[PDB]
């Protein structure tokens, strides 16, 4: 669905390609460890904040 919405631009195709991690429960923990470091990252502790 991301390619469906931002497909008309090549700068967004290069963004999803150069991306490091993929997954709904993966980038949610990636945000958790950069926002609230030092804490155990749970799929629902990041879903909460």
């Amino acid at each position: 669905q991301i390619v469906e919405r931002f497909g008309f631009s090549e700068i967004m195709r290069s963004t999803l390609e150069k991306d490091n991690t993929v997954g709904t429960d993966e980038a949610l923990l990636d945000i958790y460890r950069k926002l609230r470091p030092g804490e155990p990252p749970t799929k629902e502790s990041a879903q909460t904040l």
């Binding site: 609230r36 470091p37 030092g38 804490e39 155990p40």
Partner: protein, 86 residues
């Protein structure tokens, strides 16, 4: 044996990795001084090590006992010595 004394050190390092960063945030709101929150965390986990009853039951939340020890430490700081000088 020597591994029994090292299992106690790996147990303290375990509760550090699950409660220290969350306890620092709690003391940070009650004091507003980050350098003071670090002092409350060290003193709270030091009393956890001195009380094996809190580290015994893992089925019981040790986090709640920490927030209460830190709360009582912060209000004691808020008495006479802070009153005049701060």
């Amino acid at each position: 044996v020597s591994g029994a004394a090292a299992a106690e050190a790996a147990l303290m390092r375990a509760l550090y990795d699950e409660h220290a960063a969350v306890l620092w945030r709690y003391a940070l709101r009650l004091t507003g001084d980050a350098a003071q929150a670090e002092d409350v965390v060290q003193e709270t986990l030091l009393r956890a090590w001195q009380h094996p009853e809190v580290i015994g039951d893992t089925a019981r939340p040790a986090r709640a006992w920490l927030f209460t020890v830190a709360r009582n430490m912060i209000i004691d700081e808020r008495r006479s010595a802070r009153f005049r000088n701060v």
